[PDB]
Design an enzyme around this catalytic site. Structure first.
Site, PDB file in Angstrom:
ATOM      1  N   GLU A 277      90.659  -4.819  74.426  1.00  0.00           N
ATOM      2  CA  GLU A 277      90.234  -5.994  73.056  1.00  0.00           C
ATOM      3  C   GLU A 277      91.241  -7.056  72.985  1.00  0.00           C
ATOM      4  OE1 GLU A 277      89.510  -3.875  69.299  1.00  0.00           O
ATOM      5  OE2 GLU A 277      90.440  -1.856  70.495  1.00  0.00           O
TER       6      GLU A 277
HETATM    7  C1  LIG Z   1      89.112   8.572  71.122  1.00  0.00           C
HETATM    8  C2  LIG Z   1      89.927   6.807  71.590  1.00  0.00           C
HETATM    9  C3  LIG Z   1      89.585   5.853  71.038  1.00  0.00           C
HETATM   10  C4  LIG Z   1      90.246   5.114  71.682  1.00  0.00           C
HETATM   11  N1  LIG Z   1      89.738   3.710  72.261  1.00  0.00           N
HETATM   12  C5  LIG Z   1      90.260   2.224  72.200  1.00  0.00           C
HETATM   13  C6  LIG Z   1      89.686   1.248  72.714  1.00  0.00           C
HETATM   14  O1  LIG Z   1      88.363   1.079  72.634  1.00  0.00           O
HETATM   15  N2  LIG Z   1      90.493   0.389  73.480  1.00  0.00           N
HETATM   16  C7  LIG Z   1      92.039   0.348  73.724  1.00  0.00           C
HETATM   17  O2  LIG Z   1      92.477  -0.928  73.950  1.00  0.00           O
HETATM   18  N3  LIG Z   1      92.531   1.296  73.564  1.00  0.00           N
HETATM   19  C8  LIG Z   1      92.103   2.370  72.170  1.00  0.00           C
HETATM   20  N4  LIG Z   1      92.000   3.443  72.607  1.00  0.00           N
HETATM   21  C9  LIG Z   1      93.464   3.743  72.419  1.00  0.00           C
HETATM   22  C10 LIG Z   1      93.809   3.832  73.956  1.00  0.00           C
HETATM   23  O3  LIG Z   1      93.229   5.167  74.935  1.00  0.00           O
HETATM   24  C11 LIG Z   1      95.293   3.956  74.060  1.00  0.00           C
HETATM   25  O4  LIG Z   1      96.443   3.472  73.545  1.00  0.00           O
HETATM   26  C12 LIG Z   1      96.689   4.835  75.447  1.00  0.00           C
HETATM   27  O5  LIG Z   1      95.375   4.882  76.660  1.00  0.00           O
HETATM   28  C13 LIG Z   1      97.499   5.700  75.498  1.00  0.00           C
HETATM   29  O6  LIG Z   1      97.896   5.967  76.718  1.00  0.00           O
HETATM   30  P1  LIG Z   1      99.161   6.364  76.702  1.00  0.00           P
HETATM   31  O7  LIG Z   1     100.376   6.684  78.060  1.00  0.00           O
HETATM   32  O8  LIG Z   1     100.838   5.730  75.332  1.00  0.00           O
HETATM   33  O9  LIG Z   1      99.055   8.784  76.255  1.00  0.00           O
HETATM   34  P2  LIG Z   1      98.139   9.202  76.909  1.00  0.00           P
HETATM   35  O10 LIG Z   1      97.162   8.485  77.872  1.00  0.00           O
HETATM   36  O11 LIG Z   1      97.829  10.195  75.997  1.00  0.00           O
HETATM   37  O12 LIG Z   1      98.618   9.611  77.711  1.00  0.00           O
HETATM   38  C14 LIG Z   1     100.403  10.285  77.549  1.00  0.00           C
HETATM   39  C15 LIG Z   1      99.492  11.274  78.914  1.00  0.00           C
HETATM   40  O13 LIG Z   1     100.690  12.528  79.297  1.00  0.00           O
HETATM   41  C16 LIG Z   1     100.384  13.637  79.055  1.00  0.00           C
HETATM   42  N5  LIG Z   1     100.862  15.283  78.267  1.00  0.00           N
HETATM   43  C17 LIG Z   1     101.289  15.598  76.819  1.00  0.00           C
HETATM   44  N6  LIG Z   1     101.680  16.017  76.999  1.00  0.00           N
HETATM   45  C18 LIG Z   1     102.409  16.702  78.127  1.00  0.00           C
HETATM   46  C19 LIG Z   1     103.214  17.678  78.287  1.00  0.00           C
HETATM   47  N7  LIG Z   1     103.587  18.544  77.442  1.00  0.00           N
HETATM   48  N8  LIG Z   1     103.297  17.324  79.881  1.00  0.00           N
HETATM   49  C20 LIG Z   1     102.866  16.834  80.694  1.00  0.00           C
HETATM   50  N9  LIG Z   1     102.514  16.044  80.259  1.00  0.00           N
HETATM   51  C21 LIG Z   1     101.576  15.575  79.229  1.00  0.00           C
HETATM   52  C22 LIG Z   1      98.455  13.385  78.711  1.00  0.00           C
HETATM   53  O14 LIG Z   1      97.520  14.615  79.210  1.00  0.00           O
HETATM   54  C23 LIG Z   1      98.377  12.050  79.238  1.00  0.00           C
HETATM   55  O15 LIG Z   1      97.823  12.261  80.381  1.00  0.00           O
HETATM   56  C24 LIG Z   1      91.723   4.621  72.535  1.00  0.00           C
HETATM   57  C25 LIG Z   1      92.275   6.416  72.334  1.00  0.00           C
HETATM   58  C26 LIG Z   1      90.935   7.215  72.002  1.00  0.00           C
HETATM   59  C27 LIG Z   1      91.631   8.232  72.353  1.00  0.00           C
HETATM   60  C1  LIG Z   2      85.721  -3.286  68.495  1.00  0.00           C
HETATM   61  C2  LIG Z   2      85.910  -1.589  68.216  1.00  0.00           C
HETATM   62  C3  LIG Z   2      85.946  -0.577  67.344  1.00  0.00           C
HETATM   63  C4  LIG Z   2      86.823   0.561  67.223  1.00  0.00           C
HETATM   64  N1  LIG Z   2      87.375   1.019  68.495  1.00  0.00           N
HETATM   65  C5  LIG Z   2      88.665   0.385  68.403  1.00  0.00           C
HETATM   66  C6  LIG Z   2      90.129   1.368  68.209  1.00  0.00           C
HETATM   67  C7  LIG Z   2      91.178   0.987  68.830  1.00  0.00           C
HETATM   68  C8  LIG Z   2      92.751   1.363  68.549  1.00  0.00           C
HETATM   69  N2  LIG Z   2      93.247   0.467  67.783  1.00  0.00           N
HETATM   70  C9  LIG Z   2      93.472   0.167  66.699  1.00  0.00           C
HETATM   71  C10 LIG Z   2      95.337   0.660  66.139  1.00  0.00           C
HETATM   72  C11 LIG Z   2      95.624   1.420  65.513  1.00  0.00           C
HETATM   73  C12 LIG Z   2      96.236   2.349  64.665  1.00  0.00           C
END
Ligand SMILES: Cc1cc2nc3c(=O)[nH]c(=O)nc-3n(C[C@H](O)[C@H](O)[C@H](O)COP(=O)(O)OP(=O)(O)OC[C@H]3O[C@@H](n4cnc5c(N)ncnc54)[C@H](O)[C@@H]3O)c2cc1C
Ligand SMILES: C=C=CCNCCCCNCC=C=C
Ligand SMILES: *[C@@H]1O[C@H](CO)[C@@H](O[C@@H]2O[C@H](CO)[C@@H](O[C@@H]3O[C@H](CO[C@H]4O[C@H](CO)[C@@H](O)[C@H](O)[C@@H]4O)[C@@H](O)[C@H](O)[C@@H]3O)[C@H](O)[C@H]2NC(C)=O)[C@H](O[C@H]2O[C@H](C)[C@H](O)[C@H](O)[C@H]2O)[C@H]1NC(C)=O
Ligand SMILES: Cc1cc2nc3c(=O)[nH]c(=O)nc-3n(C[C@H](O)[C@H](O)[C@H](O)COP(=O)(O)OP(=O)(O)OC[C@H]3O[C@@H](n4cnc5c(N)ncnc54)[C@H](O)[C@@H]3O)c2cc1C
Ligand SMILES: Cc1cc2nc3c(=O)[nH]c(=O)nc-3n(C[C@H](O)[C@H](O)[C@H](O)COP(=O)(O)OP(=O)(O)OC[C@H]3O[C@@H](n4cnc5c(N)ncnc54)[C@H](O)[C@@H]3O)c2cc1C
Ligand SMILES: *[C@@H]1O[C@H](CO)[C@@H](O[C@@H]2O[C@H](CO)[C@@H](O)[C@H](O)[C@H]2NC(C)=O)[C@H](O)[C@H]1NC(C)=O
Ligand SMILES: *[C@@H]1O[C@H](CO)[C@@H](O[C@@H]2O[C@H](CO)[C@@H](O)[C@H](O)[C@H]2NC(C)=O)[C@H](O)[C@H]1NC(C)=O
Ligand SMILES: C=C=CCNCCCCNCC=C=C
Ligand SMILES: C=C=CCNCCCCNCC=C=C
Lengths: 459, 462, 462
Positions: free
Chosen positions: A58
């Site tokens: 995005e």
């Molecule tokens: C349903 C959904 C839709 C979304 N849509 C979008 C989108 O279209 N575009 C966009 O830009 N963003 C979107 N997001 C947001 C985006 O995916 C996240 O912001 C980003 O991937 C989060 O990354 P992170 O490393 O912060 O956390 P995470 O990906 O949660 O990574 C943290 C890691 O820590 C691990 N972990 C947790 N607890 C422990 C523990 N106790 N010990 C060891 N390991 C542990 C987990 O398994 C995970 O692998 C979406 C997310 C979801 C879930």
């Molecule tokens: C494009 C489209 C459809 C919606 N999927 C976007 C979800 C991304 C979530 N990040 C928002 C921040 C917050 C809270």
């Protein structure tokens, strides 16, 4: 120094890379699940891989380059399509049958857009301290001069598509100051591109990890022993001199620092015990921020009964119950000929649904579809996929959202280390909380903070 | 000085009474409807008068006397009963029939209460400016250590009962600092008494009005020309020298000052045009506070099929849909043998329900009742009453609720006078917003400010 | 609003006076002892009233007027004397008798003073966050280029006179940034005036109290019931709406706000229970700051045996044990026929001495005076007075001192209110902690912050 990174999602892999670039290569990445990527994660549904988590890059085409885009569109060339929301006015379904008049709907959308624009002007004038902030709903009341925000079914669904479908919580809970306008689009651009590649949006994470972790020359699989999957951290002990981390399987590890990348929901849950306990200031900032839930329910049918064609990709269902199975997408371009539909729900509907069977959810959805396409013979879905992120102990939600009441200073306390315990992840992104690029940049920023403290003693 | 009071609900009647007491008797009370009392108003339902609006005297038996209590309970002798909520744990129904085990429920109730008490301690320490406030939900998360507040059917209806049933909006939108603990209960006591008298709780307002307005000797009807019903104020023009007030039927009146007591919802709807326009700081204060909606749906049945007896007055429906027809009350004491039930809804369900027919709402309710009492033969209700306060232009909601985001100074801007225009009403009560006693005391307080300006020439506000 | 002020020392009386001037007169002042004045308190000794606590108006003749000065020197005309420390080089006694050579001592004083002047220059460039702060001793090593600060008996006693005699703790614990230079002298002037009047320095406080509290037209005694003596506050309960205060005699009082003027030492002790407990940020600020102790031991003798004459007022004893009975004062000017001497001790010695009998202390002092004046037949003192401020539960020390490690932000957290609980007292003075003028000004400052919050609804956040 030796650093343990908890979690191999985008932020953890990104932080470990940055650290390695600074020469800190004595790393140990402990991941709970059997794979890396965390919230970027694909799955097989109806013989095709769909995204359970993030699906779009995005913020594309603007003043600054979203760091994820080049990797997706040039380095890996993952298959993708720009989403076009321009035809929604032709696709809002009545609770009881057929679509509403497009002109009426286009004018409601205009009114909504215009109120949001006035809110952007207002937000620009609020004080940095947050003392005049208010919920987006309060801004809607003020700009429309009413005691309530959107309240008819059509206005509510328009409202839900504009806010809840991005933030995963309603406007009345969301901070205006910190979401309108939103940095992601202001900086990177207004377009969004849907990733539809069988290697998965998660390929980006595997690409980054392979730039510094060892992989098999045939397989391409990561075989570096600095990465250990299936390691659930349950306790982090720290002192002025170092840290110890214990996993659920009983292993115990030692290091000079620990970089925690687990989601805000995980941190609000108590899966990981800190000893000593994190200080009150930290604990309060953690509990005040919100971890939202956005549920992507995929459905597969024996045959197509909905429209395909220009402007048909996204469609809304205007239920009199706000947020009930309201936002739909069909994949004529992405998954040609698969007969799959995607309906998205969030917040309260997400928590209710994760708590009931797929069969029950399927039945509720079939009732809505039948109301929407009264002229068709709507077959029952043959398969359904309900992602349960809130119930999953390693995520406890899908992404953070900024609530009215938290100011920038308290949000920044989320990023702050406690002694030798550092934090990273999308909820620590300075201006991009909630996004994949936010998780990415957060890993880099968090790593830099630790490097300066650890290597230059400038904390 | 002549003073015009817009509205004859409790705060306006109470403000006019205080002015009259200070000797300001050149008054003109303009009331939009054909009666006085406002949000305290009864109506005939199936042969009995029930309250469409306020129904309890809340805050009784504590360290200070709620000023409304003596009038209700002693001066007028309005029939009333103490509500007992101690037996809720034996009365929580499963989505799909029968009640939950009492001990299971009691434990969830005890955990909910303990979190709230922990929230009261946090609240006391927050900075008085309101700058560190947070929602009740955030405090629940902190105390339960979960990324969500109550989320299973039983914990959600217990939460709804504890908070939405009082405030009419969810914990996540409600200010912790301003509602936990609540002054009404801390000051006046924990008990509440339900008024169930044919004369209506509004009798309290008729009583106060009668202490200063002339009444007919035989009918007791107010006949004072200083009270004018059916006069809807549509415009208030104010200047350094005075004020002019115009009504819909085109009447025009002049005065030295005006006291506005219309609800916050009315002010948020622009029914009254101010000239000049109110200052931006005032306008923002008006829009940021919340006007909640609490809908008392009454139902009449051909025969009884629910339990009666000890601890049966109140019962809950644990829907998997939060707030769906959740809080029930049966009237074995109030309306014996009438076969009436009252289900209360608020907020989003209220707005949805006001927008559809009573027949559709009745059929949704019959499905819920038949799920709760599967072994009974539950006859369809023969009558239903759905009060539409949000839709009524003279109210636009039921009572104000203090949201997270409004601070102490912003709440003061909501009360502040603008030139010769004063404001009063429950939304201007410093510590009792949302209550009958808060409207009563707010009337006296606003009048006193005006009296200081008018009689002591102390015209500066804060 | 009703405000309870805990303590009737200079800051409590000063705060209550400022509140009264804002028109907040529903005040209740609860004082633990049987009199007002607190750390400004006289006592009869040897038939003269001497000061057990403050004795000087410090900071006079400077660019700004010390607010206490005019009350003392002009409104009350209390008898007073400028202290002159210019002759110290002629009055430093060796451990075993006789004074050191004047020239030698002057040189050591000149060096100590030039190291301090270099410290002031360093201090000016330190970062405002306090991140570069250091102890005064670290600055002394840096400036003297040595691995220790003053370490010979004469240098040590000059150092004690220059620092400990003012701050009551040693240079090695004291923050250089916040005490060198010191605001009291930089703003109000370098001179100091010893108050020696039978009415006592406390008359200043009686004078301020009489400006708003009622007093008997005959006795001149304060008779206002808003002042209640012998009320030991032991618990303060507070919520978002008001406070409750309970005294040891079991009375209980209620109010909208409470202003706590008790000493930092009392707040560090467990005398007053806060409910709920104060927040961690607050408790940490409280325990990081220091409450010092300064003990004025008065001695009466049957005949004089020390020198009198120009420059003889102050003298020092260069013990090889730092701080051991080191700074003395004789009162030929103040109490000419008394035959009294005053030795001042602080910190570790004060705590030791408060714990042993007056007789043991008198015997230690006689061994010192007999060594200082070997050529005299020194008589045993026939009376001694040891003030026990650290042991007194209503004081727990004599005045706060700023230690290395605390920055302004944290010091300000000491002054910060917690909800409706406000604090005042010398330890909350922005720039004059430790003094009478600091107490006085902190009372006004604290009161004004409460007045803005309570009257204007503007509760300053930082
Ligand atoms: C349903 C959904 C839709 C979304 N849509 C979008 C989108 O279209 N575009 C966009 O830009 N963003 C979107 N997001 C947001 C985006 O995916 C996240 O912001 C980003 O991937 C989060 O990354 P992170 O490393 O912060 O956390 P995470 O990906 O949660 O990574 C943290 C890691 O820590 C691990 N972990 C947790 N607890 C422990 C523990 N106790 N010990 C060891 N390991 C542990 C987990 O398994 C995970 O692998 C979406 C997310 C979801 C879930
Ligand atoms: C494009 C489209 C459809 C919606 N999927 C976007 C979800 C991304 C979530 N990040 C928002 C921040 C917050 C809270
Ligand atoms: C604390 O209070 C005492 C008492 O009130 C102070 O001492 C008094 O201060 C008056 C302030 O100047 C002082 O003043 C006046 O005296 C001058 C001069 O007197 C003579 O000389 C004149 C010119 O040559 C001549 O014309 C005249 O006839 C006199 O012979 C006069 O011109 C002024 O108009 C005025 O009356 C008092 O004399 C003095 N009294 C006593 C008993 O001291 C004290 O003040 C201090 O500061 C002033 C500046 C002066 O140095 C004082 O001597 C000094 O004590 C004050 N201290 C502080 C620290 O405030
Ligand atoms: C359903 C419901 C349940 C409640 N439950 C309780 C309860 O059990 N116990 C409790 O203590 N409180 C409860 N309350 C709240 C309590 O009723 C109110 O706080 C109080 O009655 C409000 O008095 P007021 O004078 O502030 O406002 P109102 O009663 O609204 O009085 C304002 C008056 O102004 C008139 N008016 C409006 N616009 C104009 C105009 N333009 N010109 C002229 N006249 C105008 C209105 O008709 C009305 O008479 C409840 C209220 C409702 C509606
Ligand atoms: C030995 C000594 C020498 C000093 N030298 C000087 C000097 O020469 N010049 C100078 O400027 N400053 C000097 N000071 C410091 C100056 O005296 C103090 O800064 C000042 O008087 C403190 O005033 P306060 O109102 O802050 O505190 P206090 O005077 O301590 O007032 C607090 C009041 O609270 C009462 N109290 C305590 N606990 C309770 C309770 N639980 N319930 C009710 N009441 C309670 C106490 O009894 C007291 O009366 C000296 C002080 C001492 C003790
Ligand atoms: C995403 O990537 C494609 C592929 O590299 C871009 O489409 C190419 O863009 C260049 C730029 O001048 C052309 O010369 C090529 O012919 C294009 N290929 C095709 C198939 O058109 C595309 O514009 C990219 N989108 C963004 C938003 O960067
Ligand atoms: C409500 O009013 C009734 C009516 O007077 C009160 O019941 C009277 O109380 C006095 C008080 O202790 C008695 O001496 C009378 O005998 C009581 N009358 C009856 C019929 O019992 C009653 O206590 C009031 N309830 C409250 C909560 O005030
Ligand atoms: C008793 C009982 C059951 C609930 N009815 C009382 C609603 C009173 C509304 N005022 C609350 C403040 C707010 C917002
Ligand atoms: C002059 C002289 C003799 C010393 N007596 C003054 C003690 C004043 C105490 N306050 C200083 C601040 C600190 C810490």
């Amino acid at each position: 120094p030796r650093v343990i990174v908890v979690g191999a999602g985008m932020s953890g892999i990104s932080a470990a890379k940055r650290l390695s670039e600074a020469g800190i290569t004595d790393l140990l990445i402990l991941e709970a699940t059997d794979h890396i990527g965390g919230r970027m994660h694909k799955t097989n549904f109806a013989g095709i891989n769909v995204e359970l988590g993030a699906n779009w890059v995005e913020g594309v085409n603007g003043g600054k380059m979203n760091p994820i885009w080049p990797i997706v569109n040039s380095t890996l060339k993952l298959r993708n399509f720009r989403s076009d929301f321009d035809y929604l006015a032709q696709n809002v379904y009545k609770e009881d049958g057929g679509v509403y008049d497009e002109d009426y709907v286009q004018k409601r959308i205009e009114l909504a857009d215009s109120v949001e624009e006035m809110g952007e002007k207002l937000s620009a004038t609020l004080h940095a301290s947050g003392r005049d902030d208010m919920s987006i709903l309060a801004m809607q009341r003020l700009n429309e001069h009413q005691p309530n925000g959107p309240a008819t079914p059509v206005d509510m669904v328009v409202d839900y598509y504009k806010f809840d479908y991005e933030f995963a919580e309603p406007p009345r809970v969301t901070s205006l100051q910190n979401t309108v306008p939103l940095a992601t689009f202001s900086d990177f651009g207004d377009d969004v591109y849907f990733v539809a590649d069988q290697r998965g949006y998660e390929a980006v994470v595997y690409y980054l990890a392979g730039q510094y972790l060892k992989t098999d020359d045939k397989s391409g699989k990561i075989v570096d022993p600095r990465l250990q999957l299936n390691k659930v951290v349950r306790e982090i002990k720290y002192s002025p001199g170092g840290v110890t981390v214990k996993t659920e399987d009983n292993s115990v590890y030692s290091a000079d620092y620990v970089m925690v990348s687990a989601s805000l929901g995980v941190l609000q849950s108590d899966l990981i015990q800190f000893k000593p306990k994190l200080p009150t200031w930290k604990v309060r900032a953690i509990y005040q921020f919100d971890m939202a839930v956005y549920t992507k329910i995929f459905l597969k049918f024996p045959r197509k009964f909905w429209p395909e064609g220009k402007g048909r990709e996204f469609f809304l269902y205007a239920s009199s119950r706000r947020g009930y199975y309201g936002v739909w997408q069909e994949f004529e371009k992405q998954y040609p000929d698969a007969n799959v539909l995607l309906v998205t729900v969030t917040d309260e509907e997400s928590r209710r649904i994760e708590q009931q069977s797929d069969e029950q959810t399927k039945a509720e959805i079939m009732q809505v579809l039948r109301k929407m396409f009264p002229g068709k013979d709507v077959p029952d879905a043959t398969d359904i996929l309900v992602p349960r992120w809130w119930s999953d102990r390693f995520y406890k939600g899908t992404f953070s959202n900024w609530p009215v009441g938290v100011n920038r200073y308290e949000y920044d306390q989320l990023r702050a280390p406690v002694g030798r315990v550092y934090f990273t992840g999308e909820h620590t992104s300075e201006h991009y909380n909630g996004y994949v690029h936010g998780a990415y940049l957060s890993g880099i920023d968090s790593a830099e903070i630790l490097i300066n403290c650890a290597q230059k003693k400038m904390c």
